[PDB]
């Protein structure tokens, strides 16, 4: 209950899927062309059984200029531009890309994948063979659960590009209006009646970010999977609005324990769906809350779990 960074250690039994950042670190070592080929290969195979939802109209508008620029290049330049993004080179295209929210980056690559499939953007060279390190990285990806596979792909996409500056322009999709109160569903969690946890889940499912933020302490933090804590209400609300629209949280069961100084620690396990895949991918998730004596959220961590065997009382 003293520091955010120490609260990171609550429920230390929780086995997170650290194969995801492990695999991203291996991927990040590869030659840029192998990075692009590997993801092409993974994307094609995954597409046999899983369809990515179309990017939103606003997103496509925001990425349109950069996409047109690439589409106007000769093939060799197209390949160079894509390598620049993978290498995190400092170029105007790489700076534009870095200014974008994850969803806008994902929609940019969704479009390039379609154009590559159609032959209008320089494809991976015919009969391309991956490097020794890259073939093993793809094998690991293809052995993971779908929820882990899609998190590896997202993390590879978000990592590309070049950030120059701390307070650079941030471009994101418009904020959706919250769900009308009448049509809202309420979660049920075995073992857990805590109103702060239930209101957390219900407000996020409703895209009601202004209500959700009011659950947190001023200095409180949210830790997304495999990322550092996002600290304080302005940064946490920014993150909700830019990155947390249209999720479906399906918590199942939890446990409630005392912590030092009248705090309470609560662990919930269940599933989450991203709007990119709807009901076809359910990620196995734990939430770890540290609530102050008044019930506000001092810390919440969201973990991608190593296997369904990490869900409480499988
Ligand atoms: C790149 C590339 C390509 C294309 C690649 C493409 C098109 C790839 C597309 C990949 C896509 C669309 C991946 C989407 C992943 C979404 C995830 C993991 C969301 C998780 C959300 C969670 C867990 C949120 C949970 C949360 C909960 C529960 C909270 O309680 C609080 C909020 C929080 C957010 C933390 C080509 C194919 C063209 C080849 C070349 C190439 O390189
Ligand atoms: Cl998402």
* DSSP symbols for 197-230: HHHHHHHHHTT-HHHHHTTEEEEEEEE-TTSPPE
C-alpha separations of 13 from 99, 161, 288, 311 in Å: 37, 36, 12, 12
CB atoms within 10 A of CB 182: 5
How far apart (Å, rounded) are the C-alpha atoms in residues 236 and 230? 6
Residue located nearest, by CA, to atom 38 of ligand 1: 113
Taking CA atoms, 139 is separated from 27, 39, 134, in Å, by 12, 12, 9
| 161: region left, alpha or beta (phi > 0 left; psi from -120 to 50 alpha) | left
Experimental determination approach used: X-ray
Ligand 1 binding pocket mutation candidate from 106, 155, 160 (most atoms within 8 A of CB): 106
> Quick one: CA dihedral 93, 95, 97, 99, positive or negative?
negative
42 carries a ligand binding annotation: yes
Residue nearest atom 42 of ligand 1, based on CA coordinates: 36
Q: Tell me how far apart the alpha carbons of residues 112 and 90 are, in angstroms, rounded to a whole number.
A: 21
Judged by its nearest atom, the ligand closest to the C-alpha of residue 285 is: 1
Distance 109 CA to ligand 1 centre (A): 11
DSSP state at residue 182:
G
All residues at 6 or more sequence positions from 241 whose CB lies less than 8 Å from its CB, including other chains: 172, 175, 209
Cα distance between residue 174 and residue 19, in whole Å: 33
Spatial separation of the C-alpha atoms in residues 43 and 156, rounded to whole Å: 12
Spacing, Cα 290 to ligand 1 middle (Å): 27
Tokens matching residue 39: 């993801």
DSSP H/E element including 298: strand 297-304
HSE, CB side, 13 Å, CA atoms: give it for residue 157: 22
CA distance linking residue 112 with residue 66, whole number of Å: 11
Q: Is-contact 156 29, C-beta < 8 A?
A: no
CA distance 277 to 83: 27
Please choose, from the candidates 153, 170, 174, 154, the residue with its C-alpha nearest in 3D space to the C-alpha of residue 61: 174
* Those residues with Cβ within 8 angstroms of residue 178's Cβ, 6 or more apart along the chain or in another chain: 206, 207, 208, 209, 210, 211
In this structure, what is the dihedral angle of CA atoms 145, 272, 227, 61, given to the nearest 10 degrees? 100
Q: What is the largest CA-CA distance in the chain?
A: 64
Ligand lying nearest the CA atom of residue 36: 1
Q: Relative to the CA of 35, which ligand 1 atom is closest?
A: 42
Q: What is the DSSP letter of 2?
A: -
Q: By three-state DSSP, how is residue 245 classified?
A: coil
Q: Which two tokens stand for residue 85?
A: 């993004």
Q: What is the residue with the minimal CA distance to atom 29 of ligand 1?
A: 302
149 is in an annotated binding site: no
Distance of CA 76 to the CA centre of its chain: 31
Give the position, in ligand 1's atom list, of the atom nearest the Cα of 274: 19
| CA trace torsion 107, 58, 213, 98 (10° rounding) | 50
Pocket-forming residues, ligand 1, beta carbon under 6 Å: 36, 39-40, 43, 52, 106, 109-110, 112-113, 116, 150-151, 153-154, 157, 204, 224-225, 243-244, 247, 249, 272, 274, 276, 283, 285, 302
247 is in an annotated binding site: yes
Distance from the alpha carbon of residue 151 to the mean position of ligand 2, in angstroms:
10
Spatial separation of the C-alpha atoms in residues 108 and 102, rounded to whole Å: 10
- Provide the token pair at 266: 């609560």
Q: Within a 10 A sphere around the Cβ of 48, how many other Cβ atoms? A: 7
């Amino acid at each position: 209950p003293f520091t955010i960074d120490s609260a990171r250690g609550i429920f230390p039994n929780t086995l997170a899927a650290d194969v995801v950042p492990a695999t991203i670190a291996r991927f990040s070592q590869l030659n840029a062309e192998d990075q692009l080929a590997l993801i092409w290969f993974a994307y094609l195979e995954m597409g046999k059984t899983l369809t990515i939802a179309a990017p939103g109209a606003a997103s496509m508008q925001l990425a349109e200029n950069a996409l047109k620029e690439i589409q106007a290049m000769g093939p060799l330049q197209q390949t160079q531009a894509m390598c620049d993004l993978a290498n995190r080179a400092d170029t105007p295209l790489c700076r534009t890309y870095a200014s974008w929210s994850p969803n806008i980056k994902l929609g940019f690559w969704y479009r390039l994948g379609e154009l590559m499939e159609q032959g209008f953007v320089a494809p991976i060279p015919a009969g391309y063979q991956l490097s020794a390190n890259a073939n093993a990285v793809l094998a690991t990806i293809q052995g993971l659960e779908s929820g882990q596979q899609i998190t590896v792909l997202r993390n590879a996409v978000v990592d590309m590009g070049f950030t120059a500056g701390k307070d650079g322009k941030r471009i994101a999709e418009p904020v959706v209006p919250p769900q009308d109160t009448a049509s809202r569903t309420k979660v049920s969690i075995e073992g857990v009646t805590n109103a702060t946890v239930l209101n957390y889940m219900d407000n996020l499912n409703a895209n009601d970010f202004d209500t959700l933020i009011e659950l947190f302490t001023s200095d409180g933090a949210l830790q997304p999977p495999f990322q550092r804590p996002i600290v304080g209400k302005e940064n946490v609300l920014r993150f909700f609005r830019e990155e947390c629209q249209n999720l479906k949280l399906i918590p199942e069961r939890g446990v409630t324990e005392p912590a030092e100084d009248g705090f309470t620690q609560i662990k919930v396990t269940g599933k989450v769906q991203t709007p990119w895949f709807g009901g076809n991918v359910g990620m196995n998730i734990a939430w770890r809350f540290l609530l102050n004596p008044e019930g506000k959220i001092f810390f919440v961590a969201i973990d991608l779990l190593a296997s369904p065997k990490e869900l409480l009382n499988f």
